[PDB]
Amino acid sequence: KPDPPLGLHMEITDDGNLKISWSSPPLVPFPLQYQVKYSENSTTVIREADKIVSATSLLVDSILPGSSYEVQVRGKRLDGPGIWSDWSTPRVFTTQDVIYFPPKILTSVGSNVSFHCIYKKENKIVPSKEIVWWMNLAEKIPQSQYDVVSDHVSKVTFFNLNETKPRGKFTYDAVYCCNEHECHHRYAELYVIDVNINISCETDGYLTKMTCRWSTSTIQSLAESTLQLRYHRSSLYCSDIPSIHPISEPKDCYLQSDGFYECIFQPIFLLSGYTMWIRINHSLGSLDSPPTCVLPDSVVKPLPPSSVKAEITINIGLLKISWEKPVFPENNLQFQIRYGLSGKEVQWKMYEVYDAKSKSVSLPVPDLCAVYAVQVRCKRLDGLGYWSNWSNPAYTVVMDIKVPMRGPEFWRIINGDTMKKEKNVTLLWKPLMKNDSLCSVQRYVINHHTSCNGTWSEDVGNHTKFTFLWTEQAHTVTVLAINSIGASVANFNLTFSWPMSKVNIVQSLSAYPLNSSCVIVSWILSPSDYKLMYFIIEWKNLNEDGEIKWLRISSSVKKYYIHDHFIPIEKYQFSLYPIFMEGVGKPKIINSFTQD
């Protein structure tokens, strides 16, 4: 004689059927057959039914609203002349007037869902034509969606569902079935949850671990929801269409400060396909997010290229950049090089190199003697991968790269009493500017040329002034700039000749101050058999022991704007020297601004 069945419970299925369930007594090592006695007591009809079942549950079709179910169960040994147990204690279950089927639906965005309902009014089932549906008590659902499956039951069909927006605490949309204008308190719950969760992974530059991330932002609306990443590992590569696999394993994920979950795969199978999805285990049901497959080799974030060196090639003047490819991946790679002038903000120019066996590139640069910042990054040449981070900036060292392009502009002071055949000539120049020096000037050398002594050279070092004795009828001087490579390519010369110093071609010369920052100097030329190359204008204060200022001007010029501080009260001397191949001509000189 078995003990009576225990734990008699009664639940309503989503179809609206009454499932009576019980537990077998734990002490019987043999199957039991059960007899269920039940009564269904409605307001108008009593039905009694005895059913024999071998299962520990019974379905009773279509639960009647406003009815009382009484249930008893007894057990007997299935095999042989078993004795029946006593009956279970009777259990009463009292139902409600209004039925929705289903009571709840859990779906994803873009799906189709349909509900059926029955509305009881004073122990009567109303016709489906009367039933009207409403959403959130706000508004009536359009009639086109309604379908009359039968006279008693009405149905609503929803298409292309959009995510339910939460209103306060309530995560779901309340759908109502009403008899015409007047509605009832009870409603159906609609839960639509965005399962479109983006899982992104990144393999470290050392191929030692795999990092996965995913956001919570769509799911912070459901309290009581638990989230579990599940994954399935393939033997090789990813399938063309990812799918949920019945055999899956969970992964330990940790919520970060930025609101994202982190899942760490360590150690790694470089060529195993990782299929991932999120399991949402709601209080009633499990939903799986769309599965995505990731290949760790195709999600590798490579290390930046190391040992980056930027040098300007001697003699050639190209920014030569070199580096070492990062260990991974060893597959062919493409490189991106950004370069720019070093400053608070670098105007990066981009260049791409697709040669796999390329380790250094040479790019023309406009200024050879500036520091450029250069950063390099890499990606798989076939495009199947991510870009590496930019390398740590490399900086050039300023070194001389060519001989100086041009020799310095120079002038002369003549210290000598008119009665002596010998005159001291002090040559004066300024240091070359960066464009002419390129990078550096190590020394100046003066080449002398004379009819009697020929050509000789005098090393002046880093001095900007030199004084020599002018004795001969003609003495040409040339100042060269020398760096570690050699002497300047294009050099200025000046011939000092005694006969020519009487030749005067400047008919008139006038100077007019425009303002305290500009004086116009203008001159008129007489015709001359000598080919004039250029002029030099010289000006000095006569009230101060000011340095003699001078400037070279093209011979094509007949008027010049001198920008300098000119005091209209002070007397300035302006000297215009005409310069010919045979040398510096006789100056025209004025000692006052022209007042006319």
């Binding site: 191929l207 060529l271 060893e330």
Partner: protein, 146 residues
């Protein structure tokens, strides 16, 4: 299954493992060809011309790497598993039936060398693995046969 991709992938797995061994500083200084007594059972550089021998070599290597406690070698074991599976799929694309190689039945002896002298066993096993991988990559263009 793309055939071209699988050969290139075979190359990639081999190069990755070779680089892994390169990171292991003690293995680099050790001569691959050089013989060390006691380790003779490990399939070191001896010509690996065909797919069944290479597969059995990877199987033995898998057995050796599993027994030694080191983090780098283990993920590398992972790389070896993908390489073996890849070799099986390539052997399938050539219409060859490769039986799954068991490792050496005779592992009751490898334990002894690992306890008595661990250093020799790891450095030798890894350096010979690196050598074998280079030969594998070399032979992968020669139209390997079953």
């Amino acid at each position: 299954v793309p055939i071209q991709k699988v050969q290139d992938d075979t190359k990639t797995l081999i190069k990755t493992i070779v680089t892994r061994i390169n990171d292991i500083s003690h293995t680099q200084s050790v001569s691959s060809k050089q013989k060390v007594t006691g380790l003779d059972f490990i399939p070191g550089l001896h010509p690996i011309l065909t797919l069944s021998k290479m597969d059995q070599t990877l199987a033995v290597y898998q057995q050796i790497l599993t027994s030694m406690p080191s983090r780098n070698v283990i993920q590398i074991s992972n790389d070896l598993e993908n390489l073996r599976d890849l070799l099986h799929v390539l052997a399938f694309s050539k219409s060859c039936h490769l039986p799954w190689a068991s490792g050496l039945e005779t592992l009751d002896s490898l334990g002894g060398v690992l306890e008595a002298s661990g250093y020799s066993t790891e450095v030798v096993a890894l350096s010979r693995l690196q050598g074998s991988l280079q030969d594998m990559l070399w032979q992968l263009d020669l139209s390997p046969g079953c």
